[PDB]
Each structure stands twice: as structure tokens, then as C-alpha cells.
Design a protein around this ligand. Sequence first.
Ligand SMILES: O=C(O)Cn1ccc2ccccc21
Ligand SMILES: O=C(O)Cn1ccc2ccccc21
Ligand SMILES: O=C(O)Cn1ccc2ccccc21
Ligand SMILES: O=C(O)Cn1ccc2ccccc21
Ligand SMILES: O=C(O)Cn1ccc2ccccc21
Ligand SMILES: O=C(O)Cn1ccc2ccccc21
Lengths: 157, 153, 155, 155, 157, 153
Amino acid sequence: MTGAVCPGSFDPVTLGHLDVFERAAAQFDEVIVAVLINPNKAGMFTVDERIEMIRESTADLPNLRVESGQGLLVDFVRERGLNAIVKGLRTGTDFEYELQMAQMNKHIAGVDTFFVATAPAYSFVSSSLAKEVATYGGDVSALLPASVHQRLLGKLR
Amino acid sequence: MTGAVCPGSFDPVTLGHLDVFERAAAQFDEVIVAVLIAGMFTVDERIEMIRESTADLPNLRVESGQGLLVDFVRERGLNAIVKGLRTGTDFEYELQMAQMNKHIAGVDTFFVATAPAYSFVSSSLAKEVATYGGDVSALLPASVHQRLLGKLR
Amino acid sequence: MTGAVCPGSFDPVTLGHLDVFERAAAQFDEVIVAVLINPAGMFTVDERIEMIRESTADLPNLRVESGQGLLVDFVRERGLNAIVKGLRTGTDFEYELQMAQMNKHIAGVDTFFVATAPAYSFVSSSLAKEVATYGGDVSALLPASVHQRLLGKLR
Amino acid sequence: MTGAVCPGSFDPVTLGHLDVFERAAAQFDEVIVAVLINPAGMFTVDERIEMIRESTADLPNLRVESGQGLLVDFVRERGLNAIVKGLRTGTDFEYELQMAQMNKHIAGVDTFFVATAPAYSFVSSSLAKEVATYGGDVSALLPASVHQRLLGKLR
Amino acid sequence: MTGAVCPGSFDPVTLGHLDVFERAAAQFDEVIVAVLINPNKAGMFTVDERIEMIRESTADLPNLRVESGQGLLVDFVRERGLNAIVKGLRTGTDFEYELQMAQMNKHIAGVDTFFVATAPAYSFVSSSLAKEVATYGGDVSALLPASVHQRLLGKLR
Amino acid sequence: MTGAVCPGSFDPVTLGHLDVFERAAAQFDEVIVAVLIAGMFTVDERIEMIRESTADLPNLRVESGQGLLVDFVRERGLNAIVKGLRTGTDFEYELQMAQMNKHIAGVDTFFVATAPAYSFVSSSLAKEVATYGGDVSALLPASVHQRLLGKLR
Ligand SMILES: O=C(O)Cn1ccc2ccccc21
Ligand SMILES: O=C(O)Cn1ccc2ccccc21
Ligand SMILES: O=C(O)Cn1ccc2ccccc21
Ligand SMILES: O=C(O)Cn1ccc2ccccc21
Ligand SMILES: O=C(O)Cn1ccc2ccccc21
Ligand SMILES: O=C(O)Cn1ccc2ccccc21
């Protein structure tokens, strides 16, 4: 009954995210993708859109499920009877901030954070840079799942 | 006649800050905590919270400031800054500012790492965690923690 | 015929920027300084271009132009496929590397990084403006014509 | 059935190592601590294994084994394909990342990194031995049985 | 008449190196690969072997040549009428040391150093890690040019 | 009665080191340069070179040391170390040692960046460059530079 939570805003999910989801699902009995929402700032995609895009690109992972939440990540994790977070690393990750949050999260709730580096091919995509590049016409089709790419272009138009 | 200034917004002061204050006060004759001024606490509240937490440091005082930090330092006859390092410090930006501050006013900056126990608290993360019900009581002065609970509730 | 683009907001241009411009101009047949405008700063795009031209008067193979949108489009539209970017103290290098890999992926454009000289390594447009606003002397860190204009915008 | 390997020389095992072992054992069905021998240190491989077993007596799903050669072969030979590595102050993380990407490429093995607790973040096997050699007290940073053995090797 | 020097021990050359050579050759009129030799410590390959492996994998680059040297890199550069170095960045690069050397090299000889990141696919290979992995049987065939791989295995056997 | 120890091998002392010594001497009543002991110069040579370069610093002295740095510091009634930062400093390792030194002996470590002009020299790189005929005269005290040329030629 091992398990981990993969957290993020996933606005939208990228192939970097999906790589890490797949690794987590391969190494833990269950994985929950936590789509964390700031109720004060809307992103590009609604919560239901974000969840749909993740589900469509994770259909081959039988032990992965997707749920939204807000507030403290460690509460989302513990209320599901888990105490592990799996977080991806990419080029441009603020690792010092991630470390700070990992030590705080262990301190307040006993939850462990495991970091895994995304595959090199997917190491320079981020939701924010993908959106920025696509806004001005750049081709990010190879860095996003099919469940995302044309929906992104749709939002931008 | 040695002295150093420990600058920050301290909104609120943490045990990470206090650890650095104590070290500065142990190694310099005179220490001034510079409360540099839309956060949670007013300048007076932040000053009071620091003063309450530093009552056992006779050679430390707390003053508010505006404008260039180096002017604050120099106008008090000093030319040293002591700055703490924690997990999540943007050290590259601190180094840029240190070199600029030396260039424009001949002020030295000394960096000291906070104790491991207080290395992952920051004013911002403490406020965030407490806002959502997390227990940060081990990371703040007893006084500050009660005040924080007051501002939230 | 070789060439590179040096991109930035240059608000205002610093001696750190100038150092990198000079090194680019010494190593490439053609250099374009791209003054890239956003939706915002202290100097107008025209003022920024003028300050750069004043500072680069001795560089005959360097020209200054404004641009918007995707940097790699600016680069490719001028028949080039290289960017030269400066490094200074406080550069977010991890983000620069992310953008370099992205720019190579989407358009085949290479990015070359060069560290500015130690003397000019701690100036940035933002920090120079901040220090000058409160009366600090940054005249050793900016071209002379820029320092004059900066005082005017503040006074 | 999930599982991971925690690799190192562990000469000697520290409380930083133990912290990471405990977290691995709490999150994976099976953990193997791989004591990997080189062509060399203070403690023999047998002594190191014994010190780890003493320290991990409360972890029934963790076992300790020696190994040589390619780590990913050690991992795959035991039917696993995950490594759990600790991070501390002074870890060469850039090199760890290079090795993680290499290990994924050559064998499909994933590497998960976890930071040790702040209290145990500045101890390392090498620095503990160095401090103890000159009479510094590192007893708060090592399992009790290790600290006893360390004194013996020095005296 | 622009030009740059790409320096290294290249013992052996990797596909990470070759990527950077190709970019340099695309952006400068001439490129010299400088195979820098420590006369006090032999590597795995002799100088002539190193040069042969680079030449065989750079035959499509008409403006690139390969030469060995020792002592100060800036003297190698200036004696060829050049004053630019192009150096690759990969995962595990000691960038702070590279920066130190770049500032020293500018100080003593006026030579500029341009850094370029290797392609993600080739970002985790290094000569040393390739040799180490191959020593213990790991498959590094996709990270090295054909001019290198079986020669490497030969040395190891 | 403030004081700090500036430790290193100083083989040889550079202008980067000297800049940090001067800053330490400006901000602490008492400074001890600890020459911690197969390099180029003997301990006595390194001490002499530092003493020659610091003749204008009345509150600085130079002594050799062995074993734990914290014992060197504590045996002289102090509990502060001042360490310089340059381009190529392994800062993560320095932080590890600082936290260890605080833990085992209550000694604080203050870090200060060298001036930009002296930020890319190190004893090792200076020796390497000079060995192959490079001019490092702008990066070393005048005395040291002549001595270095002597050891090579
Ligand atoms: O996208 C990022 O900034 C980092 N990152 C990359 C993969 C991944 C998976 C889960 C959470 C974060 C992740
Ligand atoms: O809180 C931070 O971000 C860093 N930090 C830690 C202690 C301390 C004391 C004075 C100034 C900053 C300080
Ligand atoms: O100013 C910066 O943030 C970095 N930087 C320094 C020189 C330079 C030249 C072109 C672009 C950026 C450059
Ligand atoms: O000791 C180190 O250098 C890092 N480190 C810390 C805990 C731990 C556990 C397994 C492997 C390495 C680990
Ligand atoms: O291999 C390395 O350590 C770094 N690196 C990567 C490509 C490349 C090309 C020339 C010189 C060094 C280079
Ligand atoms: O030289 C170095 O590696 C760092 N560094 C620079 C100045 C200085 C002074 C004392 C100790 C180390 C110092």
C-alpha cells in the first residue's frame, strides 16, 4: 500500500510532468496527481480542463488518479493516508525553494519529498514557458501531450 | 568601536533572524537591526516584536529605515552589514548587492548561515503555513507566534 | 558572413552590456542589439536605442533595432541564428539555460554566453536605477551619456 | 512489490544516512543498502555492513549487501529499478544529476533524491572521520555503536 | 576571418563535444579543436588517437581543423591570430571554475570565452563518465561517435 | 575585545586574500591569519609573505596552525572565522564546514566576497599561470610576485 502525491498547478500539464508521473506510477503502488488551485488567481485552464488533459494523457497508468485541492499540500497528502511527495526537477527549477518547502513540509507534517529529474528531452519545458512561447507563435507541439496542444492554441486564439 | 547593521523587513522576525542577531551581537560591539520599510505587520509592530525577542542583547538596538541601506549604515558611523543565509536565500542577488554596496559606499557585507534548525523558515513561508493552519510555533519567538495567531484570527 | 543578436530591454544600457556588445562585435561579422519592448520602464524605446548608439559609436558592424514577440523570429528574420547573452552577478543562469535550450529546439538558434568583466559584473539596469533614485553614485558603471540622462529622468 | 537501492561507501554510516534509510524503508516495500567497495577506507566492508545493520535493526524491510561494479547492474540483478540517494550540505548535486541521467539512459533505473534532516545535513563520513581524528566530538551525528567503533579505530 | 578555439583533453571525444564543435563551425569562419595534453599524465588515448577520432567524426565540417598543444590555452589561441574560446556546458560542468578561468584568460591575454550548452541528449555524457561506465560494462554506444566506441572497448580489453 | 581568524594555506597569499584580511582588520579589534599546514612555499615563507603584505595592519598577526581550525580559534580566546569568497569557491563545502564548526565548538563563520578585481585569482591558478609565463603581477602583492618568479626561475 505504498503511495505518493505528484503536486503542481499543471496549467497545462507538459511531457516533463508526464514523464515524472510515469516514473512515480512505476515505483509506487498508487499515485495521486494533485492539481493545486489558487482560489484567488485563475490560470489559463479551469480545474476541470486541467484534470481532463492529465487524464487523457495518463490512461495507460492504471494506478494513477487525478484530484484537485488547495491550501496546504501536506494536508492533501495526509488526508489520503499517504506521506510522500514526488516532485520533478527540470532546467530552471528553483531547487533551493523546493528544498526549503521540503524541509518545512517534513517539519510540520512528517511528509517526505522525493525529487526526480525529468528526461533530458523534456527538461526545458515548463507550463509557463510553453504558454509564453506558444503565445508568440513558437512550436511547442513536441513538448506537450496531444491532450493539451490544440486546446492551448484554442485558448490563445 | 566595532559595529554592524542587520537589515530586513522582518515581517515577522523569525528564529532564523534571531539566531543571526545573536551571533552579530556576540561578535560586534554594537548592532543595529534595520527594519526597512504592504505586508502583515506595521513597522512599529515589527520593531516591537524584534525588541521583545532581543531583550537579552544589551548591545543591540532596533530602528526603522528608508532609502539606501548603505546610507543607513554610514549615517550611524558604521560600514558593515551582517546578513543571514537560509535555505532559499537568493545568494547570487545578495552577492550582487554586496558588491554594489561596497562600490558606492565602502560598506562590507558579512554573510553567516543560520542554524540548521532555523534554516528553512522565512517570514513569507511562516505566514503562508500558519495561514492554512500549520504549526510554526517552533520556528518563531514565543511572542511573535501569539501575535501572528492574532493577525490571522 | 557570421552574425549574432544581443537581446535585452537595456533600460538603460550599462557598461556590463557595452562590454558584451564589444566582445560580440569583435568576434562576429555583424551584431544586432535587439531592444525588446514589453507591455513599461524608465526610458522609451527610442531613448534606449539612442543611448546604445551613443555608447557603441566605435563599433561599425553593430547596429541597434527594436523588436517584439519571439526573439528567435527576430533573429531568423535577419538571416542569423545565434544569440550572444551576457552573464553578471545575479544572472538567473538556470533560467537562461532553459530559454537557450527552448530557443534551440523551436528555431535552431544557438546561444553563446559570455561573462562581463569583473568591474562591470555587479551592475544591472534595475539596480543602477534603484541606487541612482536614492542618490547613490553609479557613474563608474554606466556610459557617460547614460548617466547624464538618468539624472534628468530623476530630477 | 516496490523497492529501491540506497548506495554508498558508508565509511562509516552517519545519522544522515540513517535518516534517508528510514525514509526509503517507510516508502518502499523493500530497501537494499548497497555498500559499494572500491580499490581503501577506514572500515572493512564487513565492519561497515555490521554498523549499518546495528543502526537499522528496526527496519524489517531493509537489508544490507556489498557490491562492486556498475550500480545499475546491482539494482537490476535484484529485480529493482530505483535508487534512493540522500542530499546534504556539500553534496555535488550537479554530479549526482549527471549520474542519474546516465543511469536512466543505460539501464532504465530511476533515481529519487531526498534531503536529509537539517540536524544531520552537515555530517558526512569523511568530515566526521576528519573531525574525530583531531578530537572533535561528532557523537551527536553518528549512531551510538558507530561512534564507539570510530574511537577504537583512532585509539 | 572570424574564428574560435574549442579546447579539451578529448580522451575520448563524445557526442556532446561534437555537438559544440558543429555549432562553433556553423557560427565562426574557422574553428580549431585544441587537444590539450598534460605531458606529465597520460590519458587512455594517445594524442594521435584522440586527433584521429575527432577528425573521423568531423569530416563534414570543412572549416574545422584539429591540433594538439600544451601549456597556456591563451597562447595556443593567440599564436593562431585568434582571441576567442568556445566551451561547452553539460550536466556536471564545474561552471564556477570555468568562469574563474575565463576571467583569468581575459585578464592575461585579452581572449574571450563563449559558453554554449550541449544538446539535452548529450548533456550527461563526459569523457570520464563514459570511460567509467564502459569499464564496468555499461552501454555508452549512443553517446559516442562511431569513431570512438569500439576503440574505447578495445582499450578496455 | 572582538576578534576573528582568517584561515588558509596561502601558498602564496594573493591580493584576494589581502583584501579580505584588510576588511577583517577594519571590522574586528584583533585578527589572526592562520597558516594551516606539499606546496610551493614553506610555512615560514608563507608567513613572511603575509607579514610583508600586512605591515600596514597593526591589529593583524600571522601564525601557523595544525589540526582542527576551531581549536586554533578557541585556544586564542576567539570564536569567529572570516573566510573570503571568490569565483570558483566551493561554497557548498564551505557551508558544510561552517555548520560543523559551529556544532563542535560554537565558532561562527562570516563570509565576505573579495573585490571584483581580485575575484578570479587563487593561489593555485596564479601558480599555474605564472609557471607557463603568464603575467599575474596585478593579482599578487609586489613582494610575493618577485618571490614566485624566484621559485620558478
Ligand atoms: O514542471 C516543473 O516545474 C517541475 N516538474 C517537472 C516534472 C514534474 C512532475 C511533478 C511535479 C513537478 C514537475
Ligand atoms: O530570512 C532570510 O531570508 C535571511 N536571514 C536569515 C537570518 C537573517 C538575519 C538578517 C537578515 C537576513 C537573515
Ligand atoms: O544585464 C544583464 O542582466 C546581463 N548582461 C550583461 C551584459 C549583457 C549583454 C547582452 C545581454 C545581457 C547582458
Ligand atoms: O552522505 C552523503 O554524502 C549523502 N547522503 C546522505 C544520506 C544518504 C543516503 C544514501 C546515500 C547518500 C546519502
Ligand atoms: O565535455 C565537457 O565537460 C564540456 N563540453 C561539452 C561540449 C564541449 C565542447 C568543447 C569543450 C568542452 C565541452
Ligand atoms: O582564495 C580563496 O579561495 C578564498 N579567499 C579569498 C580571500 C580569502 C581570505 C581568507 C580565506 C580565504 C579567502
